[PDB]
Design a protein around this ligand. Structure first.
Ligand SMILES: CC(=O)N[C@@H]1[C@@H](O)[C@H](O[C@@H]2O[C@H](CO)[C@H](O)[C@H](O[C@]3(C(=O)O)C[C@H](O)[C@@H](NC(C)=O)[C@H]([C@H](O)[C@H](O)CO)O3)[C@H]2O)[C@@H](CO)O[C@H]1O
Ligand SMILES: *[C@@H]1O[C@H](CO)[C@@H](O[C@@H]2O[C@H](CO)[C@@H](O[C@@H]3O[C@H](CO)[C@@H](O)[C@H](O)[C@@H]3O)[C@H](O)[C@H]2NC(C)=O)[C@H](O)[C@H]1NC(C)=O
Ligand SMILES: *[C@@H]1O[C@H](CO)[C@@H](O)[C@H](O)[C@H]1NC(C)=O
Ligand SMILES: *[C@@H]1O[C@H](CO)[C@@H](O)[C@H](O)[C@H]1NC(C)=O
Lengths: 217, 222, 240, 48
């Protein structure tokens, strides 16, 4: 029972720099003269596809940028160069004897220039009032890095419940993230407050950008 | 092409049994064995088992030998699995793959991936709500639009707007737990001049509830 | 040892290339019947039946066919590349070059790795196509010659009464002429096709030039790994 | 037998557009024709 340990857990390289991914095995996965370890790549929201089979040979249709070498218990995969269309989770699989085992996965992050998020404030629609509820949601698109904190102001009073933040994968074209902070509300707290806004602190800027709206508009 | 399909998403109360399917085409079903795998929210992968369609030879992993069952029908060139004593632990996705070699080879092609989930909760049709852009901060060059889906069960739901006419700023968001309810939002980027010159409609499809909702984004009026 | 398992499985962990019905000539040329042997990965050995069913769909002969199969015994990997992309034939017409001898879902079709060029606007301008091998590994190419039934067809498809095909590389000079005759009808088509092949070394170029009866190559065959293999004759199937 | 690079050379060195070489002994009859084509350059000369 070979158990696969893959390090680093999360890899971060900008465009153009060699990216080395490695994983080790308990005993040797080499038998009959050839080491049987296969490399797999799984793009976000997609089924995994074969990259390297038997740790040296590369599948047709896979660009020659992917290089895999190794011998014995340690194997490495190198990608030269790296573009935006490379973010995925990579696994190394052994097949010396059953059962087959997979690695722990590795996210491949991308470094790039910091981008200021494009915050826009949105009011709940009139259809929502008919349903008896309320939802004010703040949109944050095209920013880098993923490290951001979203805050809520309610007539100058910080509030913390009903916070629904949905993460997203890195974009395959410009390598930027997106955020959507949703505050579920209803008919016994919406009609006693007027000012609602979202401010997000970021290392790209110094002051939190503020977008606000009022009901009486 | 050796593309392999699967069945649709599955819902069932825990403790019952399910039967998934996998359709093979474009290659000889007898030569290549069919294997299956499980992925628990992308944390890792385990190998469940494999079946040889030539003579029905089956191999299983010790973690699933108790309840996993593999059967192939040569007449229809399809592979199925049976699960027994379903549990909330088993709420994950499964992949139908074909191993190229013989207990030493690699898995060449992977299926679309059928996800399963178990919950005592019944199903709920989706409810899309309008999300009009702010009339105050109106830039002549840039404007954002979207519509949010609230109160549906279970996963998943596919969303496309204007019959997929635009695919530039399409941003979808994964659903988040909220009182055992499932909600998500979507948004695209549209030029300010083109809106509201042409109609914009966001459409949501729920295969479990078989609901087709046509919705129009009405501009906000003061 | 007088007992055997009776199956046919892989050697040293690498699955062999089991040709079910088509043969070396059919697979390398890309017979439309077997399209499951395109982009095939590394193999240990090649298994083909004693009497293949889909071999050289269109009637004809493979020049130095046994010479090529000897080379396949020492090659363990093949890769397809776009040596001469299609839709690049703006003068001659490439899509309509299809024959009824090769069925594919009831359509008349042709081989994948070769393209049959015919006239487009009642003219067949001479072509001077050259490919230079920038790949480090040895490269394999193959083309063919079409022999029409009679002179009536020659003017019908190529518009040139007398045609030639000249292929020139560093170590091969060759003038080819169509050999018109009256032949019997095998596979339903009287005309015959004589396909050729040659090995292109790295940093070497092969030049094609013809004004009719030409079959330009479409995909070329890389030689990635060279090892030891055999082309065995058996009717057995994979045994896992 | 000399195989020229192109038709331009054939007229340049031999002046005959179509040429032949016939060698005949008691047990050998042979018609030889020049096979003009476009070839690569080895030893600095394209002709063969
Ligand atoms: C039975 C018979 O010969 N009687 C003829 C009948 O054949 C003829 O139809 C044409 O006849 C020619 C000569 O044999 C071919 O059979 C034609 O078939 C095609 C083919 O399907 O293979 C059509 C195809 O489109 C052709 N390829 C190209 C480039 O267009 C091929 C190809 O030219 C040949 O294979 C090479 O010789 O031929 C067929 O249509 C009819 C109509 O004239 O008359 C009967 O008397
Ligand atoms: C197929 O293409 C390759 C490369 O395009 C050709 O390689 C050629 O190789 C020769 C010998 O090395 C080169 O000559 C040398 O070039 C260098 C750099 O230009 C120069 O500094 C030297 O003084 C010498 O001239 C030649 O340039 C190079 N051709 C190129 C780079 O275009 C090869 O010859 C081609 N195949 C055939 C059959 O022609
Ligand atoms: C991959 O890198 C190794 C060393 O890191 C090298 O030996 C090998 O030639 C490279 N493979 C390819 C295909 O470039
Ligand atoms: C063939 O060429 C003539 C010009 O000589 C042109 O008028 C005609 O349109 C061409 N045929 C086609 C099908 O384009």
């Amino acid at each position: 029972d070979i158990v696969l340990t893959q390090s680093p857990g999360s890899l971060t390289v900008s465009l153009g720099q060699r990216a080395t991914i490695s994983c080790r095995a308990s005993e040797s996965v080499d038998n009959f003269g050839k080491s049987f370890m296969h490399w797999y790549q799984q793009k976000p929201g997609q089924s995994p596809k074969l990259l390297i089979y038997r740790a040296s040979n590369r599948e047709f249709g896979i660009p020659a940028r992917f290089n895999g070498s190794g011998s014995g218990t340690d194997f490495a995969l190198t990608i030269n160069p790296v573009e935006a269309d490379d973010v995925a989770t990579y696994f190394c699989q052994q097949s010396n004897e059953d059962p087959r085992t997979f690695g722990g996965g590795t996210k491949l992050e991308i470094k790039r220039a910091d981008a200021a998020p494009t915050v826009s404030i949105f009011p709940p629609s009139s259809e929502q009032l008919t349903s008896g509820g309320a939802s004010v949601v703040c949109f944050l698109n095209n920013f880098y890095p993923k490290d951001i904190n979203v805050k809520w102001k309610i007539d100058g009073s910080e509030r913390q419940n009903g916070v629904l933040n949905s993460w997203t994968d890195q974009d395959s074209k410009d390598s930027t993230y997106s955020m959507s902070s949703t505050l579920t509300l209803t008919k016994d707290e919406y009609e006693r407050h007027n000012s609602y806004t979202c401010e997000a602190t970021h290392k790209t800027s110094t002051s939190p950008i503020v977008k606000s709206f009022n009901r009486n508009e | 092409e050796v593309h392999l399909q699967q069945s649709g998403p599955e819902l069932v109360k825990p403790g019952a049994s399910v039967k998934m399917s996998c359709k093979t085409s474009g290659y000889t079903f007898t030569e290549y064995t069919i294997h299956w795998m499980k992925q628990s929210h992308g944390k890792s992968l385990e190998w469940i088992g494999g079946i040889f369609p030539n003579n029905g030879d089956t191999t299983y992993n010790q973690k699933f030998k108790v309840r996993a069952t593999l059967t192939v029908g040569r007449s229809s060139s399809t592979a199925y699995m049976d699960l027994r004593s379903l549990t909330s632990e088993d709420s994950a996705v499964y992949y139908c793959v074909r191993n190229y070699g013989s207990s030493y080879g690699y898995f060449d092609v992977w299926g679309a991936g059928t996800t399963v989930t178990v919950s005592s909760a019944k199903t709920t049709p989706p409810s899309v709500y309008p999300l009009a852009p702010g009339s105050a901060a109106q830039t002549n060059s840039m404007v954002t639009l979207g519509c949010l889906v609230k109160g549906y069960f279970p996963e998943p739901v596919t969303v496309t707007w204007n019959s997929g006419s635009l695919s530039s700023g399409v941003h979808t968001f994964p659903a988040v737990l909220q009182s055992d309810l499932y909600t998500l939002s979507s948004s695209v980027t549209v030029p300010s001049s083109t809106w509201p010159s042409e109609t914009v409609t966001c459409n949501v499809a729920h295969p479990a509830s078989s609901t087709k909702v046509d919705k129009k984004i009405v501009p906000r009026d003061c | 040892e007088k007992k055997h398992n009776g199956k046919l499985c892989d050697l040293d962990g690498v699955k062999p290339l089991i040709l079910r019905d088509c043969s070396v000539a059919g697979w390398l040329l890309g017979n439309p019947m077997c399209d499951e042997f395109i982009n095939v990965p590394e193999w240990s050995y090649i298994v083909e039946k004693a009497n293949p069913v889909n071999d050289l769909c269109y009637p004809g002969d493979f020049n130095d066919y046994e010479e090529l199969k000897h080379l396949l015994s020492r090659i363990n990997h093949f890769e397809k590349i776009q040596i001469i992309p299609k839709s690049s034939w703006s003068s001659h017409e490439a899509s309509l070059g299809v024959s009824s001898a090769c069925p594919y879902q009831g359509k008349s079709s042709f081989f994948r790795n070769v393209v049959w060029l015919i006239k487009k606007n009642s003219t067949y301008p001479t072509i001077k196509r050259s490919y230079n091998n920038t790949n480090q590994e040895d490269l394999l190419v193959l083309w063919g010659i079409h022999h029409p039934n009679d002179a009536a067809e020659q003017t019908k498809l190529y518009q040139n009464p007398t045609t030639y095909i000249s292929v020139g590389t560093s170590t091969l000079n060759q003038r080819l002429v169509p050999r018109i005759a009256t032949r019997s009808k095998v596979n339903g088509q009287s005309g015959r096709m004589e396909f050729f092949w040659t090995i292109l070394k790295p940093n070497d170029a092969i030049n094609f030039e013809s004004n009719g009866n030409f079959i330009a190559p479409e995909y070329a065959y890389k030689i990635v790994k060279k090892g030891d293999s055999t082309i065995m004759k058996s009717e057995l199937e994979y045994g896992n």
